[PDB]
A = this chain, B = another copy of it.
Amino acid sequence: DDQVKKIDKYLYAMRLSDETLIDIMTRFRKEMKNGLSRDFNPTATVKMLPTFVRSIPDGSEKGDFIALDLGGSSFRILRVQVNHEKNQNVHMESEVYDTPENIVHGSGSQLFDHVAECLGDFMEKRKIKDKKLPVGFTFSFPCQQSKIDEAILITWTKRFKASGVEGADVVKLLNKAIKKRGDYDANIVAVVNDTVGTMMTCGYDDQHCEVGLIIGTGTNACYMEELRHIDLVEGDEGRMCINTEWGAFGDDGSLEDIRTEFDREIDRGSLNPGKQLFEKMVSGMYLGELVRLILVKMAKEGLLFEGRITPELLTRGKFNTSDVSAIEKNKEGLHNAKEILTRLGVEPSDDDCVSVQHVCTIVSFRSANLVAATLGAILNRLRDNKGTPRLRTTVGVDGSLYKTHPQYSRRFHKTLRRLVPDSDVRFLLSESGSGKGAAMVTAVAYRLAEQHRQIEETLAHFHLTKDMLLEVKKRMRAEMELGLRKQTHNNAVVKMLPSFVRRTPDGTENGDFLALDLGGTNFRVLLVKIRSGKKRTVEMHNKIYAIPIEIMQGTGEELFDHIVSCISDFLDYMGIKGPRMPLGFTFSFPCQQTSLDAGILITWTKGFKATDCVGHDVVTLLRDAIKRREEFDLDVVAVVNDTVGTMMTCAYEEPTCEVGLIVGTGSNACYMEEMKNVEMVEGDQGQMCINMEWGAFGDNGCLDDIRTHYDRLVDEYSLNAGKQRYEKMISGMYLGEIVRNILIDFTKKGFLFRGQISETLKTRGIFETKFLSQIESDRLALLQVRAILQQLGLNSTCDDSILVKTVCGVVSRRAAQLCGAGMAAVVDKIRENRGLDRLNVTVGVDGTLYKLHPHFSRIMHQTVKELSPKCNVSFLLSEDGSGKGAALITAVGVRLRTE
């Protein structure tokens, strides 16, 4: 018995006490916390990688898929088929493909080309090549994943080292491989770790399974962690499977007290020097060589074989874990030992077979013990999570060492239950391998992939290519010409109306003017004082007056009686009622003018529909209302479009400004045109600012080309169906509605809101500019988005919030691009007007959508730059509204009247 109590001392370092195993477990419990926090994760050796698997199979899984299994003992390819509807129990076939050491160590090419070939063959043997079967991929190595169908290899482990893979996405690599073959197609849909696949397999039969264990070639474990603990994944709702990749436990010196002179030597001869230190003490790729190393040490000291030592005993890996498993069976360990030892060359004495069989014991016992130390940590986590004073769960398992060693399973289970007897754990052992669990993953993944495909398909119609954009620009320019020319003018949809403002501020304007601002979100009245000369100044005051919908769509008389009423109030307010003052009337609607002070309303736009206004001169209507009240008398000098007012506001200080843009409730633009081109106004000298009224672009159908189902719905249900189509794809009054329609559709499709169309969601106007701007704010936590959605009355989850945001962006982006296409045409027509190669011009802009939206202006500018590269456009934001420009315009109006 001395022949054994002696070893125990020699290998005494590799005999861990329960006292010790407790410290190990404690440490791994920490490593887990560190691997999960976003602060410490980058340092942690235990990556706790997110797996994107939300729970174990339930039974709803159904379909037919192909699974790949690489990284373990053998490269397998399975085929799982299940459908409880048709009443077809889980069925599955499989095959193995020989993979030479040279492929596992070659280039990713060789490897993945080899994988592609094996998939080709596998499918050629069932002729399922033409079937759109979803592919699953079980990949044993640690991977960075942001989505289930992505796998960026962090680092090879076990037996693989292939160049050009670490840091890449194995999904893209495999897809490339296939492509290069053009022998068939394959829809890779998920990549899972063998652990995760194992947890899934057992879960399928045991709904208590919350863990996945793999003690084979290598060792690793996955478990169901709470989403409120996975810092690296936005969301707390529910749980997600976490791959711990604990093999790297101690890769940073963590276990320098546990590791022995033998672990250090096996490492110095390993493929991955310094890494997977915990694993190199446990898995079956190392146990065999560990034993051999210990036997070489002893032999050199005469403790075995009479200190005999053959070349085979020194050769790497001449001792297999097979032999470590064959030595330990009760019946025949010693008989096997003899044969194994004898083959080596040493002169195996019945004593040697007894000593060697004990070395194996200590080695194999330790591994198991360790895996119990860490597993204990996982369970300790689960119980703590739940809260129950006692944990009850099932642990999946797989891998060759656990499966073949006749003492490992037995011993391990015992040690674990002892370290954490505060729980009743069942050990279900996969038999199918991982395929079942894996395909159970593909099922769900593919299910989600399909939805996503439909989503993307629908949103794809809102994407515009450089060329499509250039086409819009072109169509815009064409419509611009039709509008300017007397012949084609009556039918042209882009009216190109004359403003009768012939020049930007010349710095002589002087005086006190009243102003009106009607058509934007806020109706106001203003007093603007301009003082020219050396020391020039501008002083203004205003006040917002509400207009009740009932009035905003009552009768003409009513509307202007209210307006004039507001004017009276403002006059009292400013303490200036009495005098007869000149007035500029900013009226944001398409008007036919014959002079600066006459403007006949062509048609209502946006939200206004007062009766008996269209066809009238809005200046006449105003004068009438002034006469009716009889309280005071004014000299209405001008009627101005907000575009024009905006351009003048900016021209006041920026003389390079010759363009006006509004992107608010509605959208429109104006620019300085050469009189020779304004065929609708006699004269060919100088210039005139043209109120484009480009919102109507597309009303003749010249855009049906790019309008969508959702665009038509908004148009079709608006106050002015068939009109302002271009605007209806750009401004803040409509974007929200487009979004809302997209969402209603997605909900009927079951992609959102658990497929229930909220009463809120059926309320029109719900997505105001304000909300759209907030939703698309950068780095805006999903938690915040969800917050805003619930605020509107939309009870949404994190996935909902993500989808919604994506939709808002698609719409707001298209809007900026279409707007830019228009401006592109405009600035380019100017460049030509001046026969320039390059043109510098600045645009005066205004509008709530433009001010509030965090992407519009940016994308809009980018677009104008790409579409009209021969122009350098400066967009200057108007901070005081349109009033200064209207006033400057009123001044000139007076110089003409008093002329």
Flag if A316 contacts B105 (CB, 8 Å): no
Whether B879 pairs with A783 at a CB distance below 8 angstroms is: no
Binds B, one of A9-17, A37-45, A85-93: A37-45
A19 CB-CB contact with B under 8 Å: no
Complex CA–CA separation, A777 to B42 (angstroms): 8
A620 near B: Cβ within 8 Å?
A: no
Cβ of A765 within 8 Å of any chain B Cβ, yes or no, is no
Q: Once the chains bind, are A42 and B780 in contact (CB under 8 Å)?
A: yes
Taking the closest CB of chain B, its distance from the CB of A233, in whole angstroms, is 15
Collect the chain B residues with CB atoms within 8 Å of residue A653's CB.
Answer: 107
A163 on the interface (CB 8 Å rule)? Answer: yes
Task: Give 22 pairs: A residue, B residue, CB < 8 Å, sorted on A.
Answer: A39-B781, A39-B783, A40-B784, A40-B787, A42-B774, A42-B780, A101-B539, A102-B537, A161-B879, A163-B880, A164-B879, A268-B543, A268-B545, A269-B543, A311-B575, A311-B577, A314-B573, A315-B573, A315-B574, A316-B573, A316-B574, A318-B575
Residues of B within 8 A of A522 (CB): 273
Residues of A with Cβ closer than 8 Å to B?
38-40, 42-43, 101-102, 105-107, 161, 163-164, 166, 268-269, 273, 311-312, 314-316, 318, 522, 537-546, 572-575, 577, 653, 774, 777, 780-781, 783-784, 787-788, 879-880
Closest to A778 in B: B42
Q: A43-B774, A43-B784, A653-B107 known; A316 and B273 CB under 8 Å?
A: no
A314 touches B43 (CB 8 A): no
| Chain B residues whose C-beta falls within 8 Å of the C-beta of A312 in the assembled complex | 575
Please name the residue on chain B nearest to A575 by beta carbon.
B315
Task: Give the distance to chain B from A507, nearest Cβ to Cβ, in Å.
Answer: 15
Task: Tell me, in angstroms, the Cα distance from A27 to B777 when the chains sit together.
Answer: 25
- From B544, B783, B788, contact of A273 by CB (8 A): B544
Choose from B38, B539, B572 the contact partner of A311 (Cβ within 8 Å). B572
| Complex Cα–Cα for A829 and B161 (A) | 36
Q: Which listed residue (B38, B105, B316) contacts A539, Cβ 8 A?
A: B105
Q: A39 with B784: in contact, given A314-B573, A575-B312 (CB under 8 Å)?
A: yes
Beyond the given pairs A42-B780, A315-B575, 9 more chain A to chain B contacts, judged by CB atoms under 8 angstroms and listed by A's residue number, are A38-B781, A43-B784, A43-B788, A102-B539, A105-B540, A106-B537, A268-B545, A314-B575, A316-B575
Specify which chain B residues have a CB less than 8 angstroms from the CB of A311 in the assembled complex.
572, 575, 577
Rounded to whole Å, the gap between the CB of A782 and the closest CB of chain B is 9
What is the bound-complex CA distance between A314 and B572, given in angstroms? 5
- Residue numbers in B under 8 Å from A781 (CB-CB): 38-39
The residues of B that contact A574 with a CB separation of less than 8 Å are 315-316
Q: A42-B780, A43-B784 are in contact. Are A315 and B572 (CB under 8 A)?
A: yes
Q: Which residue of B lies closest to A541 (CB)?
A: B316
For A164, what are the chain B residues with a Cβ–Cβ distance below 8 Å?
Answer: 879
Compute how far the CA of A780 lies from the CA of B166 in the bound complex, rounded to whole angstroms.
Answer: 22
Shortest 4 CB-CB contacts between residues of A and residues of B: A315-B575, A314-B572, A268-B544, A269-B543
Distance of A124 from chain B, by nearest CB (Å):
23
Q: Which of A101, A161, A316 has the most CB of B within 10 A?
A: A316
Chain B residues, Cβ within 8 Å of A316: 541, 573-575
Bound-state CA distance A543–B107 (Å) is 22
How far, in whole Å, are A102 and B573 apart by their CA atoms in the complex?
20
Inter-chain contacts of A314 with B (CB < 8 A): 572-573, 575
Shortest distance in angstroms between A244's beta carbon and chain B's nearest beta carbon? 20
Contact A784 B42, beta carbon cutoff 8 Å: yes
How far is A359 from B437 in the complex, measured between Cα atoms in Å?
76
Nearest chain B residue, comparing its CB with the CB of A311:
B575
Q: In the bound complex, how far is the Cα of B296 from the Cα of A572, in angstroms?
A: 11
Considering only CB atoms, which chain B residue lies closest to A878 in the complex?
Answer: B163
Least Cβ–Cβ distance between A646 and chain B, in angstroms: 14
Task: Name the residue of chain B whose CB is nearest to the CB of A571.
Answer: B314
> Which B-chain residue is minimally distant from A41 (CB atoms)?
B784
Q: Which residues of B contact A161 (CB under 8 A)?
A: 879-880
Question: How far apart are the CA atoms of A880 and B539 in the complex, in Å?
Answer: 75
In the complex, residue of chain B having the shortest beta-carbon distance to the beta carbon of A531 = B102
Instruction: Output the residue of A38, A161, A314, A545 with the most chain B CB within 10 A.
Output: A314
CA distance A311 to B577 in the complex (A): 8
A573, B269: Cβ atoms under 8 Å?
Answer: yes
Question: In the complex, A574 Cα to B316 Cα: how many Å?
Answer: 6
**A102: nearest chain-B partner, CB-CB:** B537
The 8 Å CB contact of A544, one of B269, B572, B573, B575, is B269
Chain B residues with CB below 8 A from A538, complex form: 102, 105-106
Distance between A42 CB and nearest chain B CB, rounded to angstroms:
5
A572 to B537 Cα, complex, angstroms: 95
With a cutoff of 8 Å between Cβ atoms, the chain B residues found around residue A572 in the complex are 311, 314-315
Nearest CB on B from A766, distance (A): 16
CB distance from A235 to the nearest CB of B (A): 13
Chain B contacts for A268, CB-based, 8 A: 543-546
Q: Which residue of B lies closest to A569 (CB)?
A: B314
Smallest CB separation, A263 vs chain B (Å): 14
A99 to chain B, nearest CB (A): 14
B42 close to A879 (CB less than 8 A): no
